[PDB]
């Protein structure tokens, strides 16, 4: 079983493995460059190893030092989104298992796809700049030379010099701070990550950060203006951690902190070890969007302990995590809620499959990313089709109690390892040996390798979903003279979640007549709702139903925050509506330079500009 990572240009794990990274760098806001040395302790896996290749992307290399002497290295031609391979000539051939340290002096480009540099005006405080990284999937190579593949796991230590007024934090345990001996206007923050991790989990943030403790092993960090709101919004964090520990085994990372980033953070959450990054769009005021914390917490087992070997097997990370996530919510709020969320996930899968096309390669559970930018293939498929498969197996094999026994042994079995779908499947068969008959009823080829919706849809309790569907159907089948019958009391017994699902169901049948949409605003006043998931769906419904009043509202939401999940579909809907098309494009052209590099690239592609 020889498997290569087609998204990486580095020497594979079968040739050599990075065991540790000692990073020493300075964050230069005036130049928007990170400069320093990356000392990689590498272990040869081959006899007579004389060179090796690392991934790099828009990096400027000053020199490479081994045994205190500069050595030869060469940068190959850039290969689009993969960057440029860096081949290093070892000064002395290595035997199998020999380890050496390679010190690389480098500097990042202001354009690094792993970073977003924000001016003071783009922050809450308005006085200090801010920097944040986002390495998943393959952007770590845009910060430092490395074997940018999740098939290799390393520990790391780091020293980061930053303006003394600011604070640095990383996906690691804080290991002290001191004034920078080479520059008194700076402070050096130190970090240590003793647990081997794939490099996509390396993370850094530098800004005017403050903290507040919200649990025995949790601090929430953000700019001062957001601290109080965040402490409240995420107060269930420790109870979610305890439940996750009960599902996957002991939490091995020490601390579990949360960092609430500026509005341009591209995801709802990112499971960086010891410090989960989250979007400020989660600050609904009622803790209603907390499934995102449950999800990132779950990656502490599925994703960070047991890791997908290559991005072709991404579903292993997300599928199991969404499955654990819904179990935490099920324990906190009831089995019927778990089913409600499961069913909602299926609807999101329908949307993705419909958007790409039912035969499209990106709708396969296991995808082949050779020549495909992972940012482009990213969708809800690995999450929901992966979740649907596990939920299907759960029902097939005897229920949640039994399948949760499998998930815990799976984590235990593959801790600190990087695996493929076959490893997963092999273990599933081993664990459920007394039920191979049942496992053999599964159409494996269709589930794992065929595009479109899964061959089978799991059974779902519909208790909580029914009222959402009923109301959605009343609006869709209503004619003009039925509009008067709608009234605020329709929403009387719906939770924010059900309100959201009601909108999701209606959005699947959009457009609705303009008159229906105006009436909906008249009786439900959806424009007043600040919950970002609800606002997102409501505005999409308004724009697709061609209500010009919603144009400025949609443009505003699309630009004041940058969570891709919201910004991309909003710009896309605005561009597809002829009345807002020109302004959408113009708005994008205008904000482009100040957006997240990756998000700007994807929106540009979606709008067919550039
Ligand atoms: C509750 C979750 C579905 C929220 C979701 N976040 C995730 O799934 C994170 O764990 C992912 N690690 C986000 C990600 C995936 C691929 C490349 C870069 C970043 C998101 O939408 O941000
Ligand atoms: Yb009628
Ligand atoms: Zn995830």
Swiss-Prot record:
Q: Which positions does the site annotation Covalently modified during suicide inhibition by leukotrienes cover?
A: 378
Q: Which organism is it from?
A: Homo sapiens (Human)
User: Which UniProt keywords are listed?
Assistant: Acetylation, Cytoplasm, Hydrolase, Leukotriene biosynthesis, Lipid metabolism, Metal-binding, Metalloprotease, Phosphoprotein, Protease, Zinc
The residues that the entry says bind Zn(2+) are 295, 299, 318
Tell me the compartments it is located in.
Cytoplasm
**Phosphoserine: modified positions:** 415
| Effect of mutating residue 139 to Q | Aminopeptidase activity almost absent, but keeps LTA4 activity
Q: What is the name of this protein?
A: Leukotriene A-4 hydrolase
- Pfam annotation, one family: Leuk-A4-hydro_C
Q: Report the PTM annotation.
A: Phosphorylation at Ser-415 inhibits leukotriene-A4 hydrolase activity.
Q: How is its activity regulated?
A: Inhibited by bestatin. The epoxide hydrolase activity is restrained by suicide inactivation that involves binding of LTA4 to Tyr-378. 4-(4-benzylphenyl)thiazol-2-amine (ARM1) selectively inhibits the epoxide hydrolase activity.
* Residues at the catalytic site: 296, 383
Which gene holds the coding sequence for this protein?
LTA4H
Effect on the protein of changing residue 136 to A: No loss of activity
Q: Outcome of residue 565 to R?
A: No effect on epoxide hydrolase and aminopeptidase activity
Family the entry assigns: Belongs to the peptidase M1 family.
């Amino acid at each position: 079983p020889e498997i290569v990572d087609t998204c990486s240009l580095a020497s594979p794990a079968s040739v050599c493995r990075t065991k540790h990274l000692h990073l020493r760098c300075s964050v230069d806001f005036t130049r928007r460059t990170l400069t320093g040395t990356a000392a990689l302790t590498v272990q040869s896996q081959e006899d007579n190893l004389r060179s090796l290749v690392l991934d790099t992307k828009d990096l400027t290399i000053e020199k490479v030092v081994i045994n205190g002497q500069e050595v030869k290295y060469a940068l190959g031609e850039r290969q689009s989104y993969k960057g440029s391979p860096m081949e290093i000539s070892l000064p002395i051939a290595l035997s199998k298992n020999q380890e050496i340290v390679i010190e690389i002096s480098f500097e990042t480009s202001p354009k690094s796809s792993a970073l977003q540099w924000l001016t003071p005006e783009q922050t809450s405080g308005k006085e200090h700049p801010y920097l944040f990284s986002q390495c998943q999937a393959i952007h770590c190579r845009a910060i430092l030379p490395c074997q940018d593949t999740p098939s290799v796991k390393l520990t790391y230590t780091a020293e980061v010099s930053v303006p003394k007024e600011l604070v640095a934090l990383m996906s690691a345990i804080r290991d002290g701070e001191t004034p920078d001996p080479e520059d008194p206007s700076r402070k050096i923050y130190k970090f240590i990550q003793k647990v081997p991790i794939p490099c996509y989990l390396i993370a850094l943030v530098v800004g005017a950060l403050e903290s507040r403790q919200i649990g025995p092993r949790t601090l929430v960090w953000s700019e001062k203006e957001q601290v109080e709101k965040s402490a409240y919004e995420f107060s269930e964090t420790e109870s979610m951690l305890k439940i996750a520990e009960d599902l996957g085994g002991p939490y091995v990372w020490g601390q579990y902190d949360l960092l609430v980033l500026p509005p341009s953070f591209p995801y709802g959450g990112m499971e960086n070890p010891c410090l989960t990054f989250v979007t400020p769009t989660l600050l609904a005021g009622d803790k209603s969007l907390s499934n995102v914390i449950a999800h990132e917490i779950s990656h502490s087992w599925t994703g960070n302990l047991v890791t997908n070997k290559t991005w072709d097997h991404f579903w292993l990370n997300e599928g199991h995590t969404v499955y654990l996530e819904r179990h935490i919510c099920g324990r906190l709020f009831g089995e019927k809620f778990r089913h409600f969320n499961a069913l909602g996930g299926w609807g999101e899968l329908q949307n993705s499959v419909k958007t790409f096309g039912e035969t499209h390669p990106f709708t396969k559970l296991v995808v082949d990313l050779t020549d495909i930018d992972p940012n482009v293939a990213y969708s809800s498929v690995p999450y929901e089709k992966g979740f649907a498969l596990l939920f299907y197996l759960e029902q097939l094999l005897g229920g949640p109690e039994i399948f949760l026994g499998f998930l815990k042994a799976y984590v235990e079995k593959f801790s600190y390892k990087s695996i493929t779908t076959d490893d997963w499947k092999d273990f599933l068969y081993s664990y459920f040996k007394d039920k191979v008959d049942v496992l053999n009823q599964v159409d494996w080829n269709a589930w794992l390798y065929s595009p479109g919706l899964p061959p089978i849809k799991p059974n779902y309790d519909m208790t909580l979903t029914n009222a959402c569907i009923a109301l959605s159907q009343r609006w869709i089948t209503a004619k003009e003279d039925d509009l008067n019958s709608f009234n605020a009391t329709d929403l009387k017994d719906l939770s924010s979640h059900q309100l959201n699902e009601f909108l999701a169901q209606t959005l699947q049948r959009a457009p609705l007549p303009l008159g229906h949409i105006k009436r909906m605003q008249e009786v439900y006043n959806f424009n007043a709702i600040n919950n970002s998931e609800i606002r997102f769906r409501w505005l999409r419904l308004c724009i697709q139903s061609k209500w010009e009043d919603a144009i400025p509202l949609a443009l505003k939401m699309a630009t004041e925050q940058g969570r891709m999940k919201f910004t991309r579909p909003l710009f896309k809907d605005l561009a597809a509506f002829d009345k807002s098309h020109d302004q959408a494009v113009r708005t994008y052209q205008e904000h482009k330079a100040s957006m997240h590099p990756v998000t700007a690239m994807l929106v540009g592609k979606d709008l067919k500009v550039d």
